[PDB]
Design an enzyme around this catalytic site. Structure first.
Site, mmCIF file in Angstrom:
data_model
loop_
_atom_site.group_PDB
_atom_site.id
_atom_site.type_symbol
_atom_site.label_atom_id
_atom_site.label_comp_id
_atom_site.label_asym_id
_atom_site.label_seq_id
_atom_site.Cartn_x
_atom_site.Cartn_y
_atom_site.Cartn_z
ATOM 1 N N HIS A 43 40.073 44.637 50.200
ATOM 2 C CA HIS A 43 40.935 43.334 51.230
ATOM 3 C C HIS A 43 42.209 43.459 52.509
ATOM 4 C CE1 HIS A 43 39.330 41.431 47.240
ATOM 5 N NE2 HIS A 43 39.444 40.649 47.416
ATOM 6 N N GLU A 46 29.320 28.947 42.692
ATOM 7 C CA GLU A 46 29.594 28.523 43.662
ATOM 8 C C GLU A 46 28.992 27.347 44.252
ATOM 9 O OE1 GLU A 46 30.866 30.762 44.648
ATOM 10 O OE2 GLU A 46 30.105 32.251 45.748
#
Lengths: 198, 588
Positions: free
Chosen positions: B480, B350
């Site tokens: 999704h 990240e």
């Protein structure tokens, strides 16, 4: 000389005249151009730059022989929650000549729709606002830049500041330079007082 | 005056006011994460309301400017993200109906109806670590008869609404809109339309197909000792024997399959306790990774505005690995950093997203972000992959510099990464192609479940344990699909993960596999990577790819070099186990 070794300014640079040479030199008149900008706009404040700040706000002359004083700050010009009190001009119909102020407020014209008191399409508000916030990065920090201008005219200069003084010794054949007269002799005590202006 | 000159003035006015509204929505979200209060929820909704209203207002006036009259090949890329309409291009009555379907698929997926327990990590750990045939089969059948049955009327109307919305923006179907993000719309010379994406992807799957056969046959052959009656050597693996509801994540199956028992997987947790780390200490060690490579350093306000420690259970706060971007030089991270190896690998994954936004910080807001979706995740995967290499960790803080592995250790490392990186590769290609036929019209409305199982044995190799009728629904329960997200972003993440690693390790005088390359102490690999990371939305991804790798499309060849010792070892271990599988065997 006392404003260079203080270690309190982030950027203390000059142009043409060296900082160690303007201490014993006369000056006709010294200006004081103080303004608060961002961090990335400090490099644009130089004789011979262009962009959207030097050509629309503060313009520097080509023969500028002064200094640029700038220090870091975040408490004397930026409060908590964001300070939007410092405006700036982004676009205008013409540029600004060096050493010239502008306090008018007009709408910029992009292409058609002549802009004169009406906003909306093809007319934008040039006066924006800086994002001086203490939570941003380093480049977004405000810098109170104070530009000093040096000029020389035919008028007699009143600001010079030549040299510092020394000690006094008598009964010796040493060299002394009182005022502009250089003499080499023995200084003795005299009881014949002269006029109080000679 | 000039049409192209006045167009830049309209964009400068938008960027001078959008950064202030976008920062308010990001600042309000951080207040709710720090202290769980109901007042911060209303502040985030009010901040996002003005953002959606100002973006829609400026999008109407932007339609008057001509788009085909752009010759600078830069302003056109900035008008595409501004003149967008989204799902609000249709009628006002159909806008609330389409958004309601997205909430119905997310409410049923969030709640648990199996008894109670949720799906993840509740039911996910049940159908993986139980070692039984009748235990994990009843839980998989009960989920399809309760969750899949309540999604039949909702998924049928989702196709007709997305088809009309896509045709309103001059396109074809829903699947064609997702392919438009990869289309070159800026600098010419590199022709890459939406029709070119149909190819290439299908070409790389054929070369990677023999690699997937050796991985699927190894897991199938391991479960033969526990299921000698149902599982046959000439058969396949059912849907309930995959450790997942849909078979996407195969990491849960690693606890049952063990390649070698002499060398265990590597762990750097013992090296963290010896050096006395305080959780924050991880952020200090991760900074030197980006400085010694060539990338710029961090900011001064990053150590005081972002959370670096754990608040504890006494303070109402949440944390999840995420990439927050407040804008205007402000960057924050919200991750409960502990003292283990799991939080060390996710830290570098990240952190790459933060260094990405710092590359184009001086660029306007319209030029920020990549031109195609899924490209940001590839920047984070190349950073976390190097954080697990033993040859790279020996030149930094943690670990001892005199640490190396043998051939028995590399088998356990390549097998674990194969069940996550390339494990979900055939599953993404299957759903991406199956949805292109349903949205267009090549599949009837009553043949959604029949064609679903036919593509499994031809792509993934999963048989049908329970023959579904016309009442069940599998794709609608995806995270999704229920959130209106594109699944193609994970396909390019796997291919671009090894292409970027091969280019950075090539200039550092290193060839061959990528399980022992060195990233630190090399200022050339960092300078080449920083080239395309500064461009953003100003240039397409086809031209930016040549600045690092040197191509215009995806390539599976760098992926085979990383799994070279694994592909060779799986060839000799599966040659007695019917390498591959047959579609003739049926579980029922």
């Amino acid at each position: 000389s006392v404003l260079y070794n203080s270690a309190s300014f982030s950027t203390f640079k000059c142009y043409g005249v060296s900082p160690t040479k303007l201490n014993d030199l006369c000056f006709t008149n010294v200006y004081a151009d103080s303004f608060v900008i961002r961090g990335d706009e400090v490099r644009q404040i130089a004789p011979g730059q262009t962009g959207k700040i030097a050509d629309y706000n503060y313009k520097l002359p080509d023969d500028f022989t002064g200094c640029v004083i700038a220090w870091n700050s975040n408490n004397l010009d930026s409060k908590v929650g964001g300070n939007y009190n410092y405006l700036y001009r982004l676009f205008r119909k013409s540029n600004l000549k060096p050493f010239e102020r502008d306090i008018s407020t007009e709408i910029y014209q992009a292409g058609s729709t002549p802009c004169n008191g009406v906003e909306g399409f093809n007319c934008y508000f040039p006066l924006q606002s800086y994002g001086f916030q203490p939570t941003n990065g380093v480049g977004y920090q405000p810098y109170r830049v104070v530009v000093l201008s040096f000029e020389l005219l035919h008028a007699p200069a009143t600001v010079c500041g030549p040299k510092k003084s020394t000690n006094l010794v008598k009964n010796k054949c040493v060299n002394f330079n009182f005022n502009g007269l250089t003499g080499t002799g023995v200084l003795t005590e005299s009881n014949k007082k002269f006029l109080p202006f000679q | 005056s000039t049409i192209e000159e006045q167009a830049k003035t309209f964009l400068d006015k938008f960027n001078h006011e959008a950064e202030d509204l976008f920062y308010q929505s990001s600042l309000a979200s951080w207040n709710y994460n720090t202290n769980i209060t109901e007042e911060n929820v209303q502040n985030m909704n009010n901040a996002g309301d003005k953002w959606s209203a100002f973006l829609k207002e400026q999008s109407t006036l932007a339609q008057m400017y001509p788009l085909q009259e752009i010759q600078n090949l830069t302003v056109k890329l900035q008008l595409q993200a501004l003149q967008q309409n989204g799902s609000s291009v249709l009628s006002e009555d159909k806008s609330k109906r389409l958004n309601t379907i997205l909430n119905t698929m997310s409410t049923i997926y969030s709640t648990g109806k199996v008894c109670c327990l949720l799906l993840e990590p509740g039911l996910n750990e049940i159908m993986a670590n139980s070692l039984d045939y009748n235990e994990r089969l009843w839980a998989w059948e009960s989920w399809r008869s309760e969750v899949g049955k309540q999604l039949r009327p909702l998924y049928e109307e989702y196709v007709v609404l997305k088809n009309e919305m896509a045709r309103a923006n001059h396109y074809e179907d829903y699947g064609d809109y997702w392919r438009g993000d990869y289309e070159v719309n800026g600098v010419d010379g590199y022709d890459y339309s939406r029709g070119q994406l149909i190819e290439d992807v299908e070409h790389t799957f054929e070369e990677i197909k023999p690699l997937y056969e050796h991985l699927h046959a190894y897991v199938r052959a391991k479960l033969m000792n526990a299921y000698p009656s149902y599982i046959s050597p000439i058969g396949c693996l059912p849907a309930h024997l995959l450790g997942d509801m849909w078979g996407r994540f195969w990491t849960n199956l690693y606890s049952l399959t063990v390649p070698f028992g002499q060398k265990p997987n590597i762990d750097v947790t013992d090296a963290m306790v010896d050096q006395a780390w305080d959780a924050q200490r991880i952020f200090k060690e991760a900074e030197k990774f980006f400085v010694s490579v060539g990338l710029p350093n961090m900011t001064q306000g990053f150590w005081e505005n972002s959370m670096l420690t754990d608040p504890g259970n006494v303070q109402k706060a949440v944390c999840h690995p995420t990439a927050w971007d407040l804008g205007k030089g402000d960057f924050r991270i919200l991750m409960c950093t502990k003292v283990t190896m799991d939080d060390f690998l996710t830290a570098h994954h990240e952190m790459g997203h933060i260094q990405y936004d710092m590359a184009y910080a001086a660029q306007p807001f319209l030029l920020r972000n990549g031109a195609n979706e899924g490209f940001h995740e590839a920047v984070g995967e190349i950073m976390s992959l190097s954080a697990a290499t033993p040859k790279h960790l020996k030149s930094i803080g943690l670990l001892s510099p005199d640490f190396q592995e043998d051939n028995e250790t590399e088998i356990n490392f390549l097998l674990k990464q194969a069940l996550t990186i390339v494990g979900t590769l055939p599953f993404t290609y299957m759903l991406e192609k199956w949805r292109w036929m349903v949205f267009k019209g090549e599949i009837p409305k009553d043949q959604w479940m029949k064609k679903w199982w036919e593509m499994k044995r031809e792509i993934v190799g999963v048989v049908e344990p329970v023959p579904h009728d016309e009442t069940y629904c599998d794709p609608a329960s995806l995270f999704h699909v229920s959130n209106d997200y594109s699944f193609i972003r994970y396909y390019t993440r796997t291919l671009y993960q090894f292409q970027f690693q091969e280019a950075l390790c090539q200039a550092a005088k290193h060839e061959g596999p990528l399980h022992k390359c060195d990233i630190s102490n090399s200022t050339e690999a960092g300078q080449k990577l920083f080239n395309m990371l500064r461009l953003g939305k100003s240039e397409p991804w086809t031209l930016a790819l040549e600045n690092v790798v040197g191509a215009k499309n995806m390539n599976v060849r760098p992926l085979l070099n990383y799994f070279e010792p694994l592909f060779t070892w799986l060839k000799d271990q599966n040659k007695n186990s019917f390498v591959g599988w047959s579609t003739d065997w049926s579980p029922y």
